[PDB]
Amino acid sequence: VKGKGSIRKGIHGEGFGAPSHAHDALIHQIKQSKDTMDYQNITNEVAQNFANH
Amino acid sequence: MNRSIFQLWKPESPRSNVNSKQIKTMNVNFGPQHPAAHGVLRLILQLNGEIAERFDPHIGLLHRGSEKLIEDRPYLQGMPYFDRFDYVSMMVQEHAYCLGIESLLGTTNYSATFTQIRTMYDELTRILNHLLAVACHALDVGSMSSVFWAFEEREKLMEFYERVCGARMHAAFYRPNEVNLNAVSSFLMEDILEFSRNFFTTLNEMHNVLTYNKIWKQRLINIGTYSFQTCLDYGLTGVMARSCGLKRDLRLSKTETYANYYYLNFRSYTGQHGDCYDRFLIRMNEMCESLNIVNQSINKISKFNNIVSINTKKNILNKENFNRQTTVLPHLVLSYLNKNDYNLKNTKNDYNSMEELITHFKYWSKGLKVESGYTYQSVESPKGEFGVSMLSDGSNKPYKCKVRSPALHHLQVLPKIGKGHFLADLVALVGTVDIVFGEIDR
Amino acid sequence: SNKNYTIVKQSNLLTMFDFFKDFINFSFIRKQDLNNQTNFNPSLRSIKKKY
Amino acid sequence: LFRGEHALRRYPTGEERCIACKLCQSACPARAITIETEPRPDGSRRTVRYDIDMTKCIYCGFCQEACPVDAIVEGPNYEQTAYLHEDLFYDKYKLLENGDKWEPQIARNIEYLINQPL
Amino acid sequence: HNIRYHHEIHTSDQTYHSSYDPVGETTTERLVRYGYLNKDQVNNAEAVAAAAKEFQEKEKRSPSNNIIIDEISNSDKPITKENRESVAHHVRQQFEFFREVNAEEVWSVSIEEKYNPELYIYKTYDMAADDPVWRQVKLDLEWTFENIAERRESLGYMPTFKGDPNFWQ
Amino acid sequence: RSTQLKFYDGGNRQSISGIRATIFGATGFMGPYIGAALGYIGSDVIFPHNHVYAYDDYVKELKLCAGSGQSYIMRHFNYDDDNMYDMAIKNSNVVINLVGSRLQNKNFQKAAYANIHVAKKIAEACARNPNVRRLIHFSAAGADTKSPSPDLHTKFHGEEAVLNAFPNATIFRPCTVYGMQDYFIRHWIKERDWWYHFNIVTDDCTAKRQPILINDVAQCVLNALKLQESAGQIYELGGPHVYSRLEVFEMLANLSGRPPKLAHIPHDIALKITQNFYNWEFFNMEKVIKDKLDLIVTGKHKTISDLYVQPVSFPQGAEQFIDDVRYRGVETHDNLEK
Amino acid sequence: WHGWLSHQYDDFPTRTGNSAFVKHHYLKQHTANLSNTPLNHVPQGAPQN
Amino acid sequence: MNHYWGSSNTIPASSTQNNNYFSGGGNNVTIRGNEIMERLPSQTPSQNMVQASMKTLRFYRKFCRLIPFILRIHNIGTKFTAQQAMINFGNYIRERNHYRDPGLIDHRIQLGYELLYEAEMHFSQHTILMQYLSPYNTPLSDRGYSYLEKVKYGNKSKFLQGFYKGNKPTEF
Amino acid sequence: RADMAHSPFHKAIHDLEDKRSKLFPDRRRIPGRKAKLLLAASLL
Amino acid sequence: MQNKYMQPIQLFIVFEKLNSKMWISKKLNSNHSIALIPSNWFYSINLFLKRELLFSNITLIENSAIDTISYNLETNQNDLDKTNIENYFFKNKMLVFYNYYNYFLKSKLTLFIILNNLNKSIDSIDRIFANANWLERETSEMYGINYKWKIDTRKLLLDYSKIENPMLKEFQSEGTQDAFYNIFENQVVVLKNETVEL
Amino acid sequence: KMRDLGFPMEGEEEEYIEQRVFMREQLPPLESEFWKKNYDPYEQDLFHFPDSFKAYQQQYKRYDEAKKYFEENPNVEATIIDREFKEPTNKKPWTRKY
Numbered sequence A: 001v002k003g004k005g006s007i008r009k010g011i012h013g014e015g016f017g018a019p020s021h022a023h024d025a026l027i028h029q030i031k032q033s034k035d036t037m038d039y040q041n042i043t044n045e046v047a048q049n050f051a052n053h
Numbered sequence B: 001m002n003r004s005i006f007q008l009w010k011p012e013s014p015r016s017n018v019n020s021k022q023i024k025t026m027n028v029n030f031g032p033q034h035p036a037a038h039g040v041l042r043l044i045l046q047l048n049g050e051i052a053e054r055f056d057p058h059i060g061l062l063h064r065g066s067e068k069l070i071e072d073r074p075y076l077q078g079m080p081y082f083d084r085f086d087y088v089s090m091m092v093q094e095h096a097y098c099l100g101i102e103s104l105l106g107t108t109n110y111s112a113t114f115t116q117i118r119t120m121y122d123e124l125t126r127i128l129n130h131l132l133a134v135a136c137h138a139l140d141v142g143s144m145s146s147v148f149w150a151f152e153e154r155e156k157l158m159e160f161y162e163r164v165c166g167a168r169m170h171a172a173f174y175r176p177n178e179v180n181l182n183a184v185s186s187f188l189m190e191d192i193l194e195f196s197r198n199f200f201t202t203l204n205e206m207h208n209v210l211t212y213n214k215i216w217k218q219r220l221i222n223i224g225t226y227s228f229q230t231c232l233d234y235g236l237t238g239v240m241a242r243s244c245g246l247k248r249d250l251r252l253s254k255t256e257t258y259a260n261y262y263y264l265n266f267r268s269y270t271g272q273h274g275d276c277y278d279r280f281l282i283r284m285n286e287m288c289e290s291l292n293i294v295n296q297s298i299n300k301i302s303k304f305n306n307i308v309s310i311n312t313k314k315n316i317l318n319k320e321n322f323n324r325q326t327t328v329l330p331h332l333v334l335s336y337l338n339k340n341d342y343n344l345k346n347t348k349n350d351y352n353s354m355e356e357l358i359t360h361f362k363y364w365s366k367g368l369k370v371e372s373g374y375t376y377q378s379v380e381s382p383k384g385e386f387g388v389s390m391l392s393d394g395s396n397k398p399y400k401c402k403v404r405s406p407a408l409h410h411l412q413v414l415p416k417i418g419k420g421h422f423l424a425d426l427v428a429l430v431g432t433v434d435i436v437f438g439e440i441d442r
Numbered sequence C: 001s002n003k004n005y006t007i008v009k010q011s012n013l014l015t016m017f018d019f020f021k022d023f024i025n026f027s028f029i030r031k032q033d034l035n036n037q038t039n040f041n042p043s044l045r046s047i048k049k050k051y
Numbered sequence D: 001l002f003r004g005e006h007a008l009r010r011y012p013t014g015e016e017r018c019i020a021c022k023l024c025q026s027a028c029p030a031r032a033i034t035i036e037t038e039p040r041p042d043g044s045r046r047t048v049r050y051d052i053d054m055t056k057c058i059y060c061g062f063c064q065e066a067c068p069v070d071a072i073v074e075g076p077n078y079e080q081t082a083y084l085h086e087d088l089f090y091d092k093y094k095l096l097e098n099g100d101k102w103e104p105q106i107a108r109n110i111e112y113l114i115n116q117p118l
Numbered sequence E: 001h002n003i004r005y006h007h008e009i010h011t012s013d014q015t016y017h018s019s020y021d022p023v024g025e026t027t028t029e030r031l032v033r034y035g036y037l038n039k040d041q042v043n044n045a046e047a048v049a050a051a052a053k054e055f056q057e058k059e060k061r062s063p064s065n066n067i068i069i070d071e072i073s074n075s076d077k078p079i080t081k082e083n084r085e086s087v088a089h090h091v092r093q094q095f096e097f098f099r100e101v102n103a104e105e106v107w108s109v110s111i112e113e114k115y116n117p118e119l120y121i122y123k124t125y126d127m128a129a130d131d132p133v134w135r136q137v138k139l140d141l142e143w144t145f146e147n148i149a150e151r152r153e154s155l156g157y158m159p160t161f162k163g164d165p166n167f168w169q
Numbered sequence F: 001r002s003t004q005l006k007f008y009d010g011g012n013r014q015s016i017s018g019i020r021a022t023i024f025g026a027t028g029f030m031g032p033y034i035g036a037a038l039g040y041i042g043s044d045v046i047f048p049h050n051h052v053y054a055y056d057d058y059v060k061e062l063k064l065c066a067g068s069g070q071s072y073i074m075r076h077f078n079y080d081d082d083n084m085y086d087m088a089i090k091n092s093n094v095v096i097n098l099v100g101s102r103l104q105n106k107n108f109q110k111a112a113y114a115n116i117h118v119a120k121k122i123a124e125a126c127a128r129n130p131n132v133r134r135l136i137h138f139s140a141a142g143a144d145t146k147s148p149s150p151d152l153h154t155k156f157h158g159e160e161a162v163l164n165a166f167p168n169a170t171i172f173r174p175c176t177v178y179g180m181q182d183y184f185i186r187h188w189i190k191e192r193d194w195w196y197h198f199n200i201v202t203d204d205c206t207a208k209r210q211p212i213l214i215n216d217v218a219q220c221v222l223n224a225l226k227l228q229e230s231a232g233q234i235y236e237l238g239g240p241h242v243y244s245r246l247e248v249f250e251m252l253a254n255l256s257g258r259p260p261k262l263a264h265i266p267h268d269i270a271l272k273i274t275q276n277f278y279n280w281e282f283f284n285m286e287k288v289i290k291d292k293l294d295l296i297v298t299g300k301h302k303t304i305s306d307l308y309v310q311p312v313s314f315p316q317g318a319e320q321f322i323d324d325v326r327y328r329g330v331e332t333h334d335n336l337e338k
Numbered sequence G: 001w002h003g004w005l006s007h008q009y010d011d012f013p014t015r016t017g018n019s020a021f022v023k024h025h026y027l028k029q030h031t032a033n034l035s036n037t038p039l040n041h042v043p044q045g046a047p048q049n
Numbered sequence H: 001m002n003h004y005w006g007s008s009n010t011i012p013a014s015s016t017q018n019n020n021y022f023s024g025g026g027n028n029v030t031i032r033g034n035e036i037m038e039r040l041p042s043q044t045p046s047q048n049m050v051q052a053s054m055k056t057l058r059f060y061r062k063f064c065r066l067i068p069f070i071l072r073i074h075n076i077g078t079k080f081t082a083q084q085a086m087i088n089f090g091n092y093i094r095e096r097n098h099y100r101d102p103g104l105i106d107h108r109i110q111l112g113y114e115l116l117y118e119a120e121m122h123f124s125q126h127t128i129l130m131q132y133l134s135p136y137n138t139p140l141s142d143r144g145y146s147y148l149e150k151v152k153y154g155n156k157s158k159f160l161q162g163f164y165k166g167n168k169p170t171e172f
Numbered sequence I: 001r002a003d004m005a006h007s008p009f010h011k012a013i014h015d016l017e018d019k020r021s022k023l024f025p026d027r028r029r030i031p032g033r034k035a036k037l038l039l040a041a042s043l044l
Numbered sequence J: 001m002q003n004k005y006m007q008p009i010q011l012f013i014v015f016e017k018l019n020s021k022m023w024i025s026k027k028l029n030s031n032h033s034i035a036l037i038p039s040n041w042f043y044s045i046n047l048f049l050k051r052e053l054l055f056s057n058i059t060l061i062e063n064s065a066i067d068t069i070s071y072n073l074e075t076n077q078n079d080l081d082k083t084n085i086e087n088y089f090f091k092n093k094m095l096v097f098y099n100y101y102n103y104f105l106k107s108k109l110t111l112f113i114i115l116n117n118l119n120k121s122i123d124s125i126d127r128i129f130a131n132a133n134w135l136e137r138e139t140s141e142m143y144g145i146n147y148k149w150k151i152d153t154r155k156l157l158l159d160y161s162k163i164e165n166p167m168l169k170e171f172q173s174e175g176t177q178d179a180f181y182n183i184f185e186n187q188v189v190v191l192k193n194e195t196v197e198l
Numbered sequence K: 001k002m003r004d005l006g007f008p009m010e011g012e013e014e015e016y017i018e019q020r021v022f023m024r025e026q027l028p029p030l031e032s033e034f035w036k037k038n039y040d041p042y043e044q045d046l047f048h049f050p051d052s053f054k055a056y057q058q059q060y061k062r063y064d065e066a067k068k069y070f071e072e073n074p075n076v077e078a079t080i081i082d083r084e085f086k087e088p089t090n091k092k093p094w095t096r097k098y
């Protein structure tokens, strides 16, 4: 992909990271849902932030 | 002059502490009891170093359910509610309501048009509204004295209201098919011309402390700038639309004109920068043009030429006739064309005619009957395009009446043009948008 | 140097998320040229009938 | 034409002008007028109750325009400030005494207004 | 003494309605949906012709005409999916209407103003002195005042309305 | 005479309950609450008063106990003319007397005037008017003919006089009443705020108290009006539990987190200084005298349970009135958001 | 005098002679604002009555 | 997440740190957020009753998590405990159990979130918002109560209790 | 036309040269005069 | 009449699957056209309007709704034909109307949508026109309209801690609650109201 | 990236920075977004992950149970809670001493 480093474009998808890198669920939610949050879903990261605080 | 763009804006990135909010934001109530919030505005404001970032305008603190009430009364009983919509410019609201009712009736008010009263008083309330708006905006910016002058010069217009209806603000003057002809006298127009002559001087007095002031220019220039695209997206009309560059005046529109405006000769002004300075200048020039329109109307109801002697070309002035006192006869056009209707109205009332007494009884007990249908009628009010969309089911009460107010759209666009500005800039912007919460909340 | 910390991740954000479609949160400040606000000359465009 | 404090008028003989037609009650946009009528023992139709809530009134003058005998009017008085909310509950005694006190000025103004069409 | 025409005879209450069929609907779909044919007899010349004649006699339009009713414009040229030239005709008509509706406004649109603008410029202490029209307005106001003053001074008195309690017998 | 009083309590501010009431001595602490309890169901309330400052909130807010056309405030009351008493209760079928000797007062003659003379006049006016059904007279729990406090002695004498003049009157003897504007918790807070380091105590704090919330006295009044068997009875109103003054100090300290500190001054010095110097709300003989006396339900008369009222506990009912004066010590970060 | 002082008209009352104002037999004398006095306006059913 | 409930909308622990060093964190669930809510988008449409029930359960869970904060900031903790408030609002929801239109349920969930946000930001008054947390057949805990009508009308049915106590004023 | 020259709707058309002179300024502002004068005077 | 007028017929040319029903009236301005639009095409139609040439220079002027469940002709019941737009007010639970102005064509366009579902659901267009945010919020709170895919669904003009649709015909103009000060709580409360009647 | 976007690149042009960073509206979403079947937030499918990891996943059993329950109960009577007064279950606020 031009101007995207080592990120590759596959079939049906542009790709969001370098090959063999872990896909992030929060960024997936950000891309798919721009500003829509049906509810405050408590993931592992949110619970960890709560525990840290 | 080097680039300082990175110092200007700060984005956010997921899970980036340096890109996030590294501070507790100042969440303040720009609440109703604030000098710059007008009466009922409760604006939840997020400040970061006195920079407005997030807006949450809470409105409805002056919502009185006026449309439901209007739907619950006969047509004439709801009309004074319009007086309480945009209580700075009163007769424009009545004019819009009466235009809607007349359109539903399929007729026109010839007695109002041939006397030029509606155009004249529309321009007078235009002067009232712009005087109040400019004075209050200057007071918000910091100029304290200018508010004392516009209020004295808008006391004379309040007296002009009081001389035709007996009220200073809520006239309830315009009626769907009736004009109180006896309320208008020639002695009133001469005082209006006197007021215009002195209003020139008072407007110049306000002119020379604000227009060329360096502080005023640095406070208003390049503040709240927007182009025609935003001006269309947010439904901006009136002075704001003329500042964004668009040529939109309902009085001068071929298919949308009303009440003698199409057959006068006046100018309208458009800005070329779309900021607060343009709006201020446009309001001053609109006041001047309103003076010009009033003068033209008075000329149209005036009798200039006289009878001269056959020899020596010497005028023969009357001695006992009323025309000797003044050249203004506010009934010469109406009596010239609609002589039959003029004669009947001046001879028969509800004290010596059976039909007229029956009409009076029905009118004041049940109201007039309006044939079923839908109408939408808009008017160039001093604050923008003010409209009424109303549907009637054939009874003496409106089935639905919806009020289109431009102050609501201006308040809606205010957060768009206020983000990134200082608190003082936000106060100045609230001043520049001529918003009244009686019209917004209704 | 202190201000440089924010700029580190800005290029990746602008290249991975579309600015006009992804609703990116940000804050900014507007600046006015003081000199340009002092020598500005007031004027307006007057519109008239078709003539 | 100034719209001030409401009053009930009389004929020059002292008879009440109001004949309890209830046109002023239905003309009121604020529903501030309440009227109840019974036949007076001499036979004439007069109100046994005529009261106006001055805290509901919008001082619009629709009621004085609706009256066909010029019974209810809005006078020139505006110094009607009260200390109690109950002082603004106007009954027939208050309106009648207001008419009996302000009759000369109201008569002069109405005389000019009547002569205007003539 | 003339009372027969105190009420308006002609009033502006007229309403005009236009109803059209879907543009993408073909002739066979229109014939089937209107109860002049059935799905079985499709793709048969005799059935199509019979349905077309029945439509043309029961309805006032051809089966290829999608204008159910047109009171607004009384158009005789339907816009149909099959006839591509009708789309070009509509585009030409709409562009001509654009030009003509913008060529009829007396104030809103003016190419001469776009090429030869007239500006108001603030230059003096007097806002009126920057425009000859406002100066003319001020002079006219002074002229009217002077005429009123001289006309009233010539008469020497002023009739007035004086109250009369004899009015209230 | 008839003690029957039929009224409709299922209404609201704009309803008609059927009660026309006159309340004496409503310019104190009980007044607004009793008036609101009566006028919130649609009653007519009249407040006779002679208050030194007419612009004080103690008079104006009495207009809020009922709506427009329901509450009336009678000013410049003589408290000495029989005609004014007759005018006050002319159309009232319920009369409530909250007049009593004020805390600042230390004069025996003024105490008798407040507790005996005014109550006697009210009861005599009630007896003359045949349309009065119920009269409720407010007394003190520790009232006694041998009390060292002139207030309690004169209140016992007033009980005797009222029961003599109007034998169908109901006597209420609250123990001690706390609320937003009271002389129990508000005085504690203000004394600690002024004497920043301590609360002044002039005894061993072994006197017993039975606090009762103000919202329960109003309910007791309403229940007594609803009960026809309470016409000529005496009721003592107190809370569920009895505490000593030291226990009350400790409980107030623990509920708010302020560490207690009771500076002790010998009784005789305090008595002499309050006797020979000017007295006001926060410095008077009445506090010194009453701090050695028990104001509790003695069991000789009927109690709050006979009015079918369940009072709230002092720790539970007093907590909301000290929320603003809570001790700000070591707290979590989430407590910064308010 | 109220109408004269507010510039409603140019007529003013006179003790004797030709008057511009009616003088009926049922007229009452002008009184000042009587609120906050023992002679205020009381509705017929108000508790003050 | 550009939303009021986003995981980055927490109040920083200190002026120089979001949390302690070596890590980040913040509380956004049991207390209010850092920035104010500027928009509340529509709930995604629910095609069946299962999605609507899930939305109701999640709204109730958020409300239960926010109860102690509301009770503390509104000074209403003496009238009832957190569990009592949860039970009263659950009684409200149970009285709304018969609903079967998913779109209506989405609308109700939007309104519930709006009212909860109003409560947690001091937009409403405590004496006004307590109408949703008050008990249905029990006295409030901050004041005494009268049991007069319990003693007099002991074993009498509801009809007799409503007959002895009228439904209109008796003077008129 | 009431907004253009030589309009019959206008009334004050005859010789009003004295009034026009009295009511309106008779001198034109020229840029730099005040600036140069004030700066030179301040330096001196 | 006495002015250049043309129907907005290209809208139904592009959307070939839609019936066309348009009205012009002398009770409206001579450049005002009213059309009927189905609910399941409203978002696509607004998408087409916002960007198509000679439509792109458009602004949304007004938005509101009509409760037609209680709409009845009161006079002249025998002067109704099949072409009257009011003929579409019968048996229809809800109506929604939008009013736009086009600067290029100098035209007013009103679009009417019939809502016949009990939950009153329709797609929002506030993502296309920035006007529709506050307008649609007020319409939704007044008439109970359920707007889907809306930017902000919060109440705009109504009081806190209340759920009601006061502009429905079933609603009485006096409401169901009144606000009073409570002495026992030292704050304002809401109670069931008893009101005067004329 | 900023120059490609169209941001100001000079000191004088910064006075109009907002016109290029805020005044441009976001593009409306495509209708295919509204025509979707599921709108749950995305999460990793833990089919091959161990059972301990599977506990942190969407509970499909609850969905199935709710679907079955709503199939069995398509219409129910509205629940009414009696407002008749009763003695409190928790009597501590009126019984506690400390």
Ligand SMILES: NC(=O)C1=CN([C@@H]2O[C@H](COP(=O)(O)OP(=O)(O)OC[C@H]3O[C@@H](n4cnc5c(N)ncnc54)[C@H](OP(=O)(O)O)[C@@H]3O)[C@@H](O)[C@H]2O)C=CC1
Residues within 6 Å of the ligand: F024, F025, F026, F027, F028, F029, F030, F031, F050, F051, F052, F079, F098, F099, F100, F101, F102, F103, F110, F113, F114, F118, F138, F139, F140, F141, F173, F174, F175, F176, F177, F178
């Ligand atoms: N609150 C408590 O803790 C308890 C109170 N009580 C008693 O209950 C009654 C009501 O309580 P509360 O409101 O708190 O008491 P207050 O002391 O606050 O109020 C006393 C009332 O009586 C009036 N009053 C006092 N002296 C005179 C006088 N000489 N002539 C006329 N009026 C007078 C006062 O009016 P003003 O001074 O303005 O003229 C005021 O309205 C009192 O008798 C009190 O002793 C009994 C037990 C406990």
Ligand code: SF4
Residues within 6 Å of the ligand: D017, D018, D019, D020, D021, D022, D023, D024, D025, D035, D063, D066, D067, D068, D069, D070, D071, D072
């Ligand atoms: S309008 Fe006049 S005549 Fe009729 S009831 Fe009223 S006061 Fe009487």
Ligand code: SF4
Residues within 6 Å of the ligand: D027, D028, D029, D030, D031, D032, D033, D052, D056, D057, D058, D059, D060, D061, D062, D063, D064
């Ligand atoms: S002036 Fe108007 S509002 Fe007042 S009582 Fe008369 S009709 Fe009613």
Ligand SMILES: [Zn+2]
Residues within 6 Å of the ligand: F145, F153, F157
């Ligand atoms: Zn003794």
